[PDB]
């Protein structure tokens, strides 16, 4: 199908909150092999974040219940939701590895690296045995790559740079049990954004300040 058709259909789905339809559109677009526009990048991001978001939410409820036929029912329901979660993550991580990251021609890089970090972090939330160590290392490596590029190429107020720090902070806190590092990374990103608030443009303003608020909320929670 035509890129333009798929993109218009994705935008319709987004408004309708039909994220499975939305992600199906954006998977097909990405698979055409051309670089995504900024608009298409956000479409992809929103669609997959809500598709996996649903499973994340459900998984947290059911595993909390498991932690309290029998307990078995919960366990089996948890495992089915897990399967779904992982297949969504595995799709995203395949799209990033097969198309998006290799053809990102601008500092796009990032994002897709951030995204790679996030979907591996979502796998790490649920990973149990053999492969968890590898999953967590992939998540760390992608975030670090993205982090290093972002420091070279973007102001400290740039929305994708702040969003990356935020998520990387959460990775350190939640996946790597590294609350010192999480707080230091959050605090630095926040303070550097403040110091250089004069660099924040009108078109980025609202997003960057919302992420700044989120950095501040986590820092509060982690020090509380």
């Amino acid at each position: 199908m035509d890129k333009n058709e798929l993109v218009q259909k994705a935008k319709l789905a987004e408004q309708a909150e039909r994220y499975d339809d939305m992600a199906a559109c954006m998977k097909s677009v990405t698979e055409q092999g051309a670089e995504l526009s900024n608009e298409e990048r956000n479409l992809l991001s929103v669609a997959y974040k809500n598709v996996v978001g649903a499973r994340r939410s459900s998984w947290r409820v059911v595993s909390s219940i498991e932690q309290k036929k029998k307990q078995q029912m919960a366990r089996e329901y948890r495992e089915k939701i897990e399967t779904e979660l992982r297949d969504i993550c595995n799709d995203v991580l395949s799209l990033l590895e097969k198309f998006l990251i290799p053809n990102a021609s601008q500092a796009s890089k990032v994002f897709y690296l951030k995204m790679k970090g996030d979907y591996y972090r979502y796998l790490a939330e649920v990973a149990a045995g053999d492969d968890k160590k590898g999953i967590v290392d992939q998540s760390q490596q992608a975030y670090q790559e993205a982090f290093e590029i972002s420091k070279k190429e973007m102001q400290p107020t740039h929305p994708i740079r702040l969003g990356l720090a935020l998520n990387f902070s959460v990775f350190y806190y939640e996946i790597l049990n590294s609350p010192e590092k999480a707080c230091s990374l959050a605090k630095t990103a926040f303070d550097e954004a403040i110091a250089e608030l004069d660099t924040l443009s009108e078109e980025s303003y609202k997003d960057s300040t919302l992420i700044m608020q989120l950095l501040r909320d986590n820092l509060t929670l982690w020090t509380s």
Partner: peptide, 10 residues
């Protein structure tokens, strides 16, 4: 008590 992460779009 779970922390916040970044919004989907930039």
């Amino acid at each position: 008590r779970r922390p916040e992460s970044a919004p989907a779009e930039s």
